[PDB]
Design a protein around this ligand. Structure first.
Ligand SMILES: NC(=O)c1ccc[n+]([C@@H]2O[C@H](COP(=O)([O-])OP(=O)(O)OC[C@H]3O[C@@H](n4cnc5c(N)ncnc54)[C@H](O)[C@@H]3O)[C@@H](O)[C@H]2O)c1
Ligand SMILES: NC(=O)c1ccc[n+]([C@@H]2O[C@H](COP(=O)([O-])OP(=O)(O)OC[C@H]3O[C@@H](n4cnc5c(N)ncnc54)[C@H](O)[C@@H]3O)[C@@H](O)[C@H]2O)c1
Ligand SMILES: NC(=O)c1ccc[n+]([C@@H]2O[C@H](COP(=O)([O-])OP(=O)(O)OC[C@H]3O[C@@H](n4cnc5c(N)ncnc54)[C@H](O)[C@@H]3O)[C@@H](O)[C@H]2O)c1
Ligand SMILES: NC(=O)c1ccc[n+]([C@@H]2O[C@H](COP(=O)([O-])OP(=O)(O)OC[C@H]3O[C@@H](n4cnc5c(N)ncnc54)[C@H](O)[C@@H]3O)[C@@H](O)[C@H]2O)c1
Ligand SMILES: COc1cccc(Nc2cc(C)nc([C@@H]3CCN(C(=O)c4nonc4N)C3)c2)c1
Ligand SMILES: COc1cccc(Nc2cc(C)nc([C@@H]3CCN(C(=O)c4nonc4N)C3)c2)c1
Ligand SMILES: COc1cccc(Nc2cc(C)nc([C@@H]3CCN(C(=O)c4nonc4N)C3)c2)c1
Ligand SMILES: COc1cccc(Nc2cc(C)nc([C@@H]3CCN(C(=O)c4nonc4N)C3)c2)c1
Lengths: 429, 429, 429, 429
């Protein structure tokens, strides 16, 4: 009944200014507008979205409308909404129900407001976290027959879709864009490579060069963190449980050992594992004075922060999201973002260009499911490679790249189409 | 009937000396010898092997005999045999039929001498290229019922296996070792990173720093080549047809453009594409005087060497595998290895440690098929991830890497066994 | 008469907290405190200091008092004082006259309050810019006979000292600390390497990877800037007027060309030249939409900001020290810090460890002049190499570096003392 | 009386071919020919040269003749002569007295043949090692008044000229080009960076990635070696006696410790110190099995090879300049080039482009002394910066560099000439 609900609609001009700046760093989304604003391949679609209502997501929203869709939006987190961004979407005449600092009750309400449109119920789900997908299946299963497809971009959401399918709960075809090369590499590797040191610097202003930096995990996040630190002249040590990832680290010349050993040597500690119990009290007790300890991996479970609160003799807040503990041995630990994500707590998260790749993935998913009614049966499907390739291609102009086109003869010799896809499904890049 | 056939068995003390050195660089294979010589898991096995008869292969061969197997061998290429390696294998009482400079008839003959042992015929195939596999199926199909498994490590061989399977010709279970992470990364990326510049240096002794180097392709070979050239202070320009691979290069700060533009800029040219018509007369006509041109990708189809032979006013052999042409415009081009593989023509191919990973994959496949017949249907199977991990784990000691073991608690949290596998099959590393 | 003058002495607990953190990053100064607090080598000294009243400078100040000196201080710039640092110095009973947002009259006043102590006038000068040195010589020349030495750390100040000496105006021996290896490398190369991208990120939050970055100049600041940008995966193009510096860039694989050509290519522009007319309207007219332009070299003379103010159709303040202009061609330029120093306008300047090297040079100079009057004629003297080495040696413990000591035999072979100096004065490192 | 003496004058065509190839990698020398072949600034000069009679030095010789000088040449080492190069110079009508494998008696004779020309005695000395300079002063002091100048390019020769001057022996003005930036950087840093791994690879074919490489010394040679090894994925450890050099290493993220510690960890050992007793028996006894030990620094005094010969239980030659010792502990050491220079023993020395910078330095010295009769008094002088700059500038075209020219206004503001020099004499680059 409310046409939108935002904090302050007067912030819309400030939102529009930020939008004007972000658009230039989001060419993937802007290419989609250039290519599809006349043909309007999403005409008919009624997309309910649930995703961090940021400046970046606003560019995504307005891309979808430009492609012909009706769109109604909520946030997937209670603090990630940027109110000026939300105001700008509201003022543009797009139903948005989101503000910074929602209650759990207000959060659910917001999502519920996106389900019904002027002409009828939603017919497409765009989700980050599975909350919109879970709400429809548990609370509003009447609407499932009318929904053509789900796009999902997070690890949690994809893991959740696989369980729903395993248990017979899932009733709508779903495209997983989380495991696209263009999504995964920007969200995990390039993103964290840019923002790790940004967070550490804003938090501490510390010299990186000449320090030992211990990075737990050498997956895509660890790889980027390690590369970043190394570029500044830090000596990086890696820890790993996977022998293949450990081997990769060794072949780049990184020392690889255990946290038990490395806790005695590190000036800076970065956890990127996705796993519990990486840095623990017995590690803290061995650390050099004023060791910087932060997490860029799993939400808040990698570092035993509760140990520091329970065993330290002093806790002094330095600035927002920077606390300095003194231990019984008389040495200090500088803990960043309360053991949560350093890139969100002490910096501005992912750069716009990163979000461009992730959201251009989701625009592709939406078109693919909506444009091909009967193509995808109920289940979780990977985004086809040709669309993953089209995401990358959409950014090349901005990257100052001239891509080569295969000649017909060359394509014949390779046994592939000159428009792609160019690699088999098992190709690792 | 003849117990072996080599060029000169007087080279066995030389071969043995080279073997001893190689063993220390092949910890994967030596770790297999340590772990499995008491249990003799390949006891009973009569393995026919068709694989370049090198020092490295000779270590693989003696690893298979340490594991209990009887083995008989030939090279999979007419020039690839190292005679001293073959002589050392011969003196050790291993029947080996291989020498440098075989004829095509002699090549076939050599493979045919490996099919029948003392106690009877072969029961296992270890292959590189599919020749030994194609010989059995077309010319000795009576031996097929008694053969338990094939292991194949080459792209050529695996494509050939899939076609045999699609057309009902394949009669034996086959493990594909080519697409293992440990095999593919070493054979493609790290191997070429180690040896590209070795070849160029041996051929030319040229300064690399301060040159423009044009690398066609940014797959695993291109990535390795590009990284190597960049380490020496060359400015690397990349050409690509895949949007994803092109973007990957852009994100490491490489210029990405077309060969049409780059041919006027490059001092050095390296083709890594696996494709036809990469460097053409069109391009040669524009190159700087004394541009160095070489191929490390596909055998011989990437550079149009035929054009040079037909259109140049001079062709001068500088040294073996180094030809300097003078064109009608008066400018000179230095072609390496006749447009064939520079790392083989102008250097010593892959370092032993690279082959340790590829051949340790092989031993895993041979154990896996001889030990568990029950397990694999007639068809082409990827090596299981746990064995791929084990290949990597076997090399970590040599690298002085201390791997972390997950606690029971951590493994339960991650929903994985603390012995692995640690990644899903779609994980790209 | 007034015992100190600060903005708000209630900020002393905040200052003290910041000092404690900084001390651990300034091992050079803390090593001086450990080595010299028993012998009090600056006992008797009444040092007037004119140097940015920061947390780092506050550590220097308390180091000088630990060494026995009486000291009185003012900032060498009207905005550079950190009030909390000044308040902490004030509460500690050090007479300090400095605050953020002084007037020019107040600036002079503040320096004039440092000339006369309790027991009498100053006898030593520690200076940054030459202002305290110029004030004494023109306005208090009666105090010159009682002053034993000057230490000066700034290019501006040293040029000024040489002119004073050439024209017979200088009446006190002066050590030049600006051209020490430990000072110059940290203040110019490593400092700017640490903070360039900190400034750009804080200002813009922009992705660096995959951009063309144009760095004008390849001296020590350009080298550092270039290395940093390159580490993030930006493609760095360099402009130079010196053939040697240009060649150095070429040999690391940087493209070297003119601003006239590069202005059409760059996404980011960093001037490091110390020279006028580097970026002009001529260049702005050619730039890509939303090109980021910033200066980290000379104060404000490198970019023609005046042209932008006079010829743009829009100037919008995005945030403090970030202005986005729209030109008559419709394209936008993002100017950082009003063409002034990006690392100061948009970040926190040099990390503490950098200033530790510069200020540990200062302490060495002050000890050297107060302890050995006999030694230095009226004139400008480079810091002796052995003291430059000692500055570096003092920082090695923090870096967990184990230095090798020459044996007596090795030192005799090399014709040097095993305590140094280890290099001739022309050695460039 | 003999017009030349070479090994075989029939090798001249092969020499000329190598010369044609080298000229394209020696633009500095070729630029000198382009600029000066008409004006002929060395007309009148009668230059006796003493320098490794290589293909590269042949380009230098023919550059000097092109500039108007009469030239007669000998080698400065008894094995460095490349006979085909010597043949080509002989056939061109230039008196050359040099062959590979001279006796000490033959060596002296060769130098003596260069002293007298058709029209009179030599009037200029071009020297590498000081042997020609020492011969004239001790044995032929009658000729000293007729000699306008000496150019010298080696550390030994420059150290020798300073002692001669200190003792009153030196009677001719001398230009030291050894300490030019362009000479020193190419001879010490860029040169060894290119050739170290070339030597190790040709000697061993070993994998570099994943190994610990211990580099003793972090001067210009160590810096280049370390950078090279790091680029291949080795983990580099540094040892150092100088705290400034140690600090530099630490700021690039290299572990810095002692050989006593590092001998237990290293897979590869490289000595670059210029000093005795770097690697010793007690280090060898701790080394991992098949550790590779080589020297690229001082001739043959850094490694205690005599210890290996006296204490090892086996010594096996692998190939030329590669010996593998077995110790009493049962482990093996692979020693390269008998502890002499690995880049000369196991590779082809410096690339041509390196020699171009060194020899273009000497052409500048010769012109400078000959063209300015009364400018330089007797003594050792550094080559002026403007000529060092001109050397760099001569190579920029080949490096694909477009150098910027200062505007008159810019030059005024900087207080320098728009033609240079651009830096003060103490500038370190
Ligand atoms: N901060 C962010 O904005 C951000 C962005 C993307 C992803 N992430 C998160 O980062 C985490 C890792 O992401 P990824 O893509 O690198 O995952 P990944 O699976 O590629 O990498 C995780 C690595 O950690 C290793 N590991 C697991 N337990 C370990 C232990 N106890 N000690 C050492 N190593 C251990 C695993 O072997 C694995 O290789 C995930 O939790 C993901 O949600 C955070
Ligand atoms: N030299 C050796 O010993 C050696 C070792 C391993 C592999 N190889 C060979 O190297 C080749 C490449 O192997 P890979 O693993 O890098 O394969 P890949 O598929 O990972 O890389 C090939 C890349 O070339 C690109 N490409 C194709 N045609 C192109 C064109 N016309 N212009 C520009 N780019 C083009 C593709 O996009 C692809 O990214 C194969 O032929 C393989 O057999 C050689
Ligand atoms: N941001 C800071 O806090 C900070 C710190 C230290 C130094 N600086 C300043 O940075 C500037 C440079 O310092 P540096 O140590 O690198 O000096 P430098 O002399 O080592 O480097 C300056 C380089 O700029 C080049 N150059 C001059 N005019 C040029 C032109 N028109 N085009 C292209 N290149 C040109 C010169 O050839 C020189 O190599 C100085 O003004 C210095 O005061 C700033
Ligand atoms: N192989 C070649 O072709 C080649 C080329 C150029 C120079 N060189 C030689 O290389 C050597 C070094 O040249 P450079 O220009 O690097 O000299 P440098 O003085 O710049 O470097 C030598 C470094 O070794 C350090 N050192 C001295 N004794 C040490 C010890 N016992 N342990 C550890 N470090 C120690 C010194 O502190 C110094 O920094 C010289 O002997 C030079 O003649 C060889
Ligand atoms: C500190 O400033 C910010 C700025 C933006 C968002 C946030 N808040 C979160 C909270 C949580 C729990 N997760 C995320 C992820 C990881 C980074 N992402 C984005 O940056 C992003 N996603 O959509 N637009 C974007 N921009 C999504 C971001 C905080
Ligand atoms: C230059 O001297 C040598 C040395 C070794 C082998 C060769 N010959 C070939 C020929 C062909 C056609 N293909 C190969 C591939 C590519 C790299 N490989 C190995 O290096 C390798 N494979 O088994 N042991 C190994 N070592 C296999 C090698 C030539
Ligand atoms: C952004 O907040 C800050 C923080 C610190 C200082 C400033 N202000 C200036 C102003 C001017 C004109 N010059 C400088 C130089 C360059 C770098 N320096 C230091 O960082 C530094 N010097 O003493 N302690 C230090 N810290 C000295 C710094 C501003
Ligand atoms: C193995 O092949 C070669 C090739 C060339 C020369 C040598 N021999 C020596 C011997 C000694 C004692 N010193 C040197 C120095 C260091 C390297 N230098 C040159 O390369 C070089 N100098 O003049 N033209 C050149 N080319 C000079 C070279 C060996």
């Amino acid at each position: 009944k409310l046409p939108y609900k935002v904090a302050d609609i007067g912030l819309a001009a400030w939102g529009r200014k930020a939008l004007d700046i972000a658009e230039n760093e989001m060419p993937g989304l802007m290419r989609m507008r250039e290519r599809y604003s006349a043909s309007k391949p999403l005409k008919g679609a009624r997309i309910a979205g649930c995703l961090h209502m940021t400046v970046e997501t606003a560019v995504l929203i307005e891309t979808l409308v430009t492609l012909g869709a009706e769109v109604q939006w909520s946030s997937c987190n209670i603090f990630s909404t940027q109110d000026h961004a939300a105001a700008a979407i509201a003022k543009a005449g797009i139903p948005v129900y989101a503000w910074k600092g929602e209650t759990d009750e207000e959060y659910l309400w917001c999502i519920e407001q996106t389900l019904y449109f002027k002409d009828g119920p939603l017919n497409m789900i765009l989700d980050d976290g599975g909350d919109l997908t879970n709400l429809i299946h548990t609370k509003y299963p009447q609407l499932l027959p009318g929904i053509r497809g789900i796009s999902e971009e997070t690890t949690t959401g994809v893991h959740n879709l696989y369980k729903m399918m395993a248990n017979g709960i899932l009733k709508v075809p779903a495209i997983n864009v989380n495991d696209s090369v263009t999504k995964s590499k920007f969200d995990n590797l390039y993103g964290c490579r840019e923002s790790l040191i940004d967070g550490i610097k804003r938090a501490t202003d510390v010299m990186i060069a000449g320090k030992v930096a211990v990075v737990a995990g050498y997956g895509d996040v660890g790889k980027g963190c390690a590369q970043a630190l190394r570029g500044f002249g830090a000596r990086v040590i890696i820890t790993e449980i996977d022998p293949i990832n450990a081997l990769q680290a060794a072949m780049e010349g990184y020392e690889v050992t255990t946290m038990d050993e490395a806790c005695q040597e590190g000036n800076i500690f970065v956890t990127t594992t996705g796993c519990i119990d990486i840095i623990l009290g017995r590690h803290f007790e061995q650390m050099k004075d004023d060791a910087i300890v932060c997490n860029i991996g799993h939400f808040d479970v990698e570092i035993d922060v509760k140990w520091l609160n329970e065993n330290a003799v002093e806790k002094v807040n330095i600035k927002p999201q920077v606390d300095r503990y003194r231990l019984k041995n008389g040495r200090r630990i500088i803990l960043l973002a309360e053991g949560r994500l350093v890139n969100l707590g002490c910096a501005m998260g992912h750069p716009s260009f990163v979000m461009s790749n992730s959201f251009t993935n989701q625009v592709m998913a939406q078109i693919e499911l909506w444009t091909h009614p009967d193509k995808y049966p109920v289940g979780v499907h990977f985004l086809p490679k040709k669309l993953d390739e089209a995401v990358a291609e959409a950014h090349l102009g901005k990257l100052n790249v001239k891509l080569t086109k295969l000649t017909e003869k060359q394509a014949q010799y390779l046994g592939m189409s000159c428009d792609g896809p160019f690699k088999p499904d098992h190709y690792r890049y």
